[PDB]
Swiss-Prot record:
The record marks 9 as: May be important for binding to chitin. The chain holds residues 24 to 67 of 67 of the full protein. Granular hemocytes, small secretory granules. The lineage of its organism: Eukaryota, Metazoa, Ecdysozoa, Arthropoda, Chelicerata. It comes from the Eukaryota. This is Tachystatin-A2. The presence of a 'disulfide through disulfide knot' structurally defines this protein as a knottin. Exhibits stronger antimicrobial activity against the Gram-positive bacteria (S.aureus (IC(50)=4.2 ug/ml)) and fungi (C.albicans (IC(50)=3.0 ug/ml) and P.pastoris (IC(50)=0.5 ug/ml)) than Gram-negative bacteria (E.coli (IC(50)=25 ug/ml)). Binds to chitin (8.4 uM are required to obtain 50% of binding). Does not cause hemolysis on sheep erythrocytes. Has no blocking activity on the P-type calcium channel. Has also been shown to weakly inhibit Kv1.2/KCNA2 voltage-gated potassium channels and TRPV1 receptors. Its main location: secreted. Disulfide bonds join 4-24, 11-29, 23-41. One of its GO terms (biological process) is killing of cells of another organism. One of its GO terms (cellular component) is extracellular region. Keywords: Antibiotic, Antimicrobial, Disulfide bond, Fungicide, Ion channel impairing toxin, Knottin, Potassium channel impairing toxin, Secreted, Signal, Toxin, Voltage-gated potassium channel impairing toxin. GO terms for molecular function: potassium channel regulator activity; toxin activity. It comes from Tachypleus tridentatus. It is found in: Secreted.
Amino acid sequence: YSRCQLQGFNCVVRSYGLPTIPCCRGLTCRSYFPGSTYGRCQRY
């Protein structure tokens, strides 16, 4: 229970209120670029 996403997965830079579970500590979430609504997640 209480788990985080995986590495090399996708992310949501529009999830307002942080509704989607964010990657676990150590992983960051960036968008493919300014003007989109998606991105990826890696272990920093």
